[PDB]
Design a protein around this ligand. Structure first.
Ligand code: HEM
Ligand SMILES: *[C@@H]1O[C@H](CO)[C@@H](O)[C@H](O)[C@H]1NC(C)=O
Ligand SMILES: *[C@@H]1O[C@H](CO)[C@@H](O)[C@H](O)[C@H]1NC(C)=O
Ligand SMILES: *[C@@H]1O[C@H](CO)[C@@H](O)[C@H](O)[C@H]1NC(C)=O
Ligand SMILES: *[C@@H]1O[C@H](CO)[C@@H](O)[C@H](O)[C@H]1NC(C)=O
Ligand SMILES: [Ca+2]
Ligand SMILES: [K+]
Ligand code: NA
Ligand SMILES: [Zn+2]
Length: 595
């Protein structure tokens, strides 16, 4: 009995099936299978779930149960031994801007979101978790190892809740636990517009028939727009500075205010849509609000698609790009468009690219005022620094002129993320992304490094010397063997990220294959892919080939000087050019006449 008969929490629609627009939910994209790619279903399983007890208990849950005859090291112990470092000197990517980093997280937020088990919407179960570090039900807390400096400062654990899983009420049969993807698997600017119909509506401007997105009515950035405020309380964005009392933004994606450079990007995108909608009203003043909304949403979609595949992926994948994503050959409805559970871990390589500080720059790209450079940790759930301290332009110049942190085998994830992450529920700049990422791998039934190495047709090291040969790093392989005893057991997040980077890319071989395959499928199985004939006209497509991120900024800021290639490393003024020399989106080909 093969079962496609579980996935409770979803909106149940009938498919127009001849509409020229994507659904919000991702439904109806695959006609033969309407729900493939849709939000609020299981992640795809590229390999079966590996659970302590075959069903649902993560490896590391039962302090007695081995993985392959070895105990699994504490998540915080792996973090401490291997992923931490002290010296931020020489850590920075010499040929990737902070924009490289920042686009990573935007693409990721469009593709996949695996929400923490709610249950508690005001709860004593969050008390039993945080204050009493009691493992049970959805509380799967990250216990501090011995010697841990947080032992003395915070308590015995970081609280951690398990990911949401399909059928909060299964089908009563007997299957492994499968995590939900709450966003649309397609690259469709869901993170701007929503993946759930009702939010997608609340985001829109329905007071006018101009198909705009809703903008803030209390604050402006020198005429340009801010996102509406998430008026839901209590606000983690109010909590980090109760004097300021500036809430988090409301976006197509829950996570839009997690950090100020993410909030900025979400601001840029919403602006381009209102701009797209406005230019489309001039050309076609007879178009209704819906047509306007959908036609811009359709362009904004292709924009993300173009930038991801043309500018970003080749510089992540390097020499492996062509091997995994050859020249497109048209919509293949036999291709699974769904994001894999393993992918949602493969893409977290972005965490080794976030640096320790963010900078605001003046119009000369010099330090904007006295507090120009800030530690990253001050900027989680920080909306007040935009709204009450310079707008988004000073942060955007930082995106162009500053660099991403390079992944380093000795310097993996900066202390701003490893020791001082803020979480929206909790009250302390005191959490560990690296430790969470590893707790999450086990939460989600991830098979091990050698499983995935094997899945990618790569050699699977079993000994010290083997692993030393794969990582080209005697010490790093040693620390791993001492923690995990067998490469077999190495959790996939540290596994893949521990590999040295392929020629001309910023991930190693196993990551390049996991990411390469996924992006290949997000393209080929997308009936609304921009290069898919009939989706756009041949001319609209000639038009779209000319978009850049440089332009998006030029049209949606008061920034005048930008680089051509916004993703490589750019120094001012040598690498900057006036906006007037940057190609525009010619919207002439979207003019629709009844004569
Ligand atoms: C704060 C955080 C960031 C920067 C300051 C940051 C950055 C990235 C980049 C650059 C990514 C990709 C290139 C990326 C991907 C994914 N992240 Fe991550 N990220 C920050 C904070 C978080 C937090 C918090 C989480 C949740 C961790 C948890 O398990 O609860 C997080 C996750 C992810 C993620 C998984 C998405 C999913 O499908 O659930 C990425 C693919 N990031 N981040
Ligand atoms: C930076 O990388 C880009 C990627 O396209 C490449 O073309 C450029 O030559 C590189 N510049 C360097 C290493 O300075
Ligand atoms: C909606 O559009 C109108 C007309 O363009 C504008 O004046 C108004 O402020 C908008 N409302 C919101 C909440 O964006
Ligand atoms: C809070 O915001 C005010 C201005 O609103 C600022 O002067 C002060 O430094 C901020 N406090 C913190 C804790 O960041
Ligand atoms: C489409 O995908 C299927 C299933 O993976 C594959 O076997 C087939 O060759 C593809 N068809 C074409 C014409 O590319
Ligand atoms: Ca999406
Ligand atoms: K998987
Ligand atoms: Na995220
Ligand atoms: Zn201005």
């Amino acid at each position: 009995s093969w079962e496609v008969g579980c996935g409770a929490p979803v909106p149940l629609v009938k498919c127009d099936e001849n509409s020229p627009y994507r659904t919000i939910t991702g439904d109806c994209n695959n006609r033969r299978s309407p729900a493939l790619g849709a939000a609020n279903r299981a992640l795809a399983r590229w390999l079966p779930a590996e659970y302590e007890d075959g069903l649902a208990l993560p490896f590391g849950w039962t302090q007695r149960k081995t993985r392959n005859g070895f105990r699994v090291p504490l998540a915080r112990e792996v973090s401490n031994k291997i992923v931490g470092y002290l010296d931020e000197e020489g850590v920075l990517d010499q040929n990737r801007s902070l924009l490289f980093m920042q686009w990573g997280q935007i693409v990721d937020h469009d593709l996949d979101f695996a929400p923490e088990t709610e249950l508690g919407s005001n709860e004593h179960s969050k008390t039993q978790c945080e204050e009493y570090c009691i493992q049970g039900d959805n509380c799967f807390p990250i216990m501090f190892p011995k010697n841990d400096p947080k032992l003395k400062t915070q308590g015995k654990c970081m609280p951690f809740f398990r990911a949401g899983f399909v059928c909060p009420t299964p089908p009563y049969q007997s299957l492994a636990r499968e995590q939900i993807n709450a966003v649309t698997s397609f690259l469709d600017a869901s993170l701007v517009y929503g993946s759930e119909p009702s939010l997608a509506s609340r985001l829109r401007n329905l007071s006018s028939p101009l198909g705009l997105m809703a903008v803030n009515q209390e604050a402006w950035d020198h005429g340009l727009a801010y996102l509406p405020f998430n008026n839901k309380k209590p606000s983690p964005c109010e909590f980090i500075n109760t004097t300021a009392r500036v809430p988090c933004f409301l976006a197509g994606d829950f996570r839009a205010s997690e950090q100020i450079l993410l909030a900025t990007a979400h601001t840029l995108l919403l602006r381009e849509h209102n701009r797209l909608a406005r230019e489309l009203k001039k050309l076609n003043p007879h178009w209704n609000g819906e047509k306007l909304y959908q036609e811009a949403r359709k362009i904004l979609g292709a924009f993300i698609q173009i930038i991801t595949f043309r500018d970003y992926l080749p510089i992540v994948l390097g020499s492996e790009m062509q091997k995994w994503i050859p020249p497109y050959q048209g919509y293949n409805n036999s291709v699974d468009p769904r994001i894999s559970n393993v992918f949602t871990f493969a893409f977290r390589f972005g965490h080794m690219e976030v640096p320790s500080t963010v900078s605001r720059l003046d119009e000369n790209y010099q330090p904007w005022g006295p507090e120009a450079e800030l530690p990253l940790h001050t900027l989680f759930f920080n909306t007040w620094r935009i709204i009450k301290d310079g707008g988004i332009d000073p942060l955007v110049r930082g995106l162009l002129a500053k660099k991403s942190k390079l992944m380093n085998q000795d310097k993996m994830v900066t202390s701003e993320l490893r020791n001082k992450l803020f979480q929206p529920t909790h009250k302390i700049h005191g959490f560990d992304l690296a430790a969470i990422n590893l707790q999450r791998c086990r939460d989600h039934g991830m098979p091990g490094y050698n499983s995935w190495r094997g899945f990618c047709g790569l050699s699977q090291p079993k000994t010290l010397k083997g692993l030393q040969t794969v990582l080209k790093n005697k010490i790093l392989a040693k620390k791993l063997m001492d923690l995990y005893k067998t490469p077999d057991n190495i959790d996939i997040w540290i596994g893949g990220n521990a590999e040295p980077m392929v020629e001309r890319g910023r991930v190693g071989p196993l990551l390049a294959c996991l990411l390469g395959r996924q992006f290949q499928q997000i393209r080929d199985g997308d009936r609304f892919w921009w290069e898919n004939p009939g989706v756009f006209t041949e001319k609209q497509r000639d038009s779209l080939q000319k978009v850049s991120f440089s332009r998006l900024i030029c049209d949606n800021t008061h920034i005048t000087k930008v680089p051509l290639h916004a993703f490589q490393a750019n120094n001012y003024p040598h690498d900057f050019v006036d906006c007037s020399t940057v190609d525009k989106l010619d919207l002439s080909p979207w003019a629709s006449r009844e004569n």
